[PDB]
A paper describes a structure:
The M2–1 transcription antiterminator factor is a basic protein of 194 amino acids that exists as a stable tetramer in solution and is essential for the complete sequential transcription of mRNAs in HRSV. It harbours four distinct regions: an N-terminal zinc-binding domain (ZBD; residues 7–25), an α-helical tetramer­ization domain (TD; residues 32–49), an RNA-binding core domain (RBD; residues 69–172) and a C-terminal unstructured region (residues 173–194). Given the relevance and uniqueness of this viral transcription antiterminator, we set out to investigate its RNA-binding domain (residues 73–194) using X-ray crystallography and folding thermodynamics.
The HRSV M2–1 RBD crystallized with two molecules in the asymmetric unit. The structures from both crystal forms are virtually identical in the core region (residues 58–177), with a root-mean-square deviation (r.m.s.d. on Cα atoms) of 0.3 Å. The elution profile from size-exclusion chromatography indicates that the HRSV M2–1 RBD exists as a monomer in solution. The folding studies reveal that although the RBD shows inter-monomer contacts and contacts the ZBD from neighbouring monomers in the tetramer, these do not influence its structure or stability.
Residue numbers in the entry: 1 to 103
Write the structure that this text describes.
């Protein structure tokens, strides 16, 4: 808990009693920080049948939703079944880590 990354890792890992609401609020903050052009660039570094391309595209779709409306996207994420939400968070965190390391 405390800090976007701490909250999201904790939610995925089922520690620190993170509520669904808190995780989705932190996700919105992370998506705001991510740049979809950066991710499209990472995506295009991949070979044509890399499984990563599909993943990159889902995270691009989250960023685009969040950009149009933060609060609506928080509500949307909160409606995903918890297992679906955690995979969403993991893929987004993974892309955040890649960009951070290579900056």
């Amino acid at each position: 808990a405390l800090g976007v990354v701490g909250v999201l890792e904790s939610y995925i890992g089922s520690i620190n009693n993170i509520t669904k609401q808190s995780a989705c609020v932190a996700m919105s903050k992370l998506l705001t920080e991510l740049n979809s052009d950066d991710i499209k660039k990472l995506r295009d570094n991949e070979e044509l049948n890399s499984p990563k391309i599909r993943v990159y595209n889902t995270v691009i779709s989250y960023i685009e939703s969040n950009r149009k409306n933060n609060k609506q996207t928080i509500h949307l994420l909160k409606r995903l079944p918890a297992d679906v939400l955690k995979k969403t968070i993991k893929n987004t965190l993974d892309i955040h880590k890649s960009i951070t390391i290579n900056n």
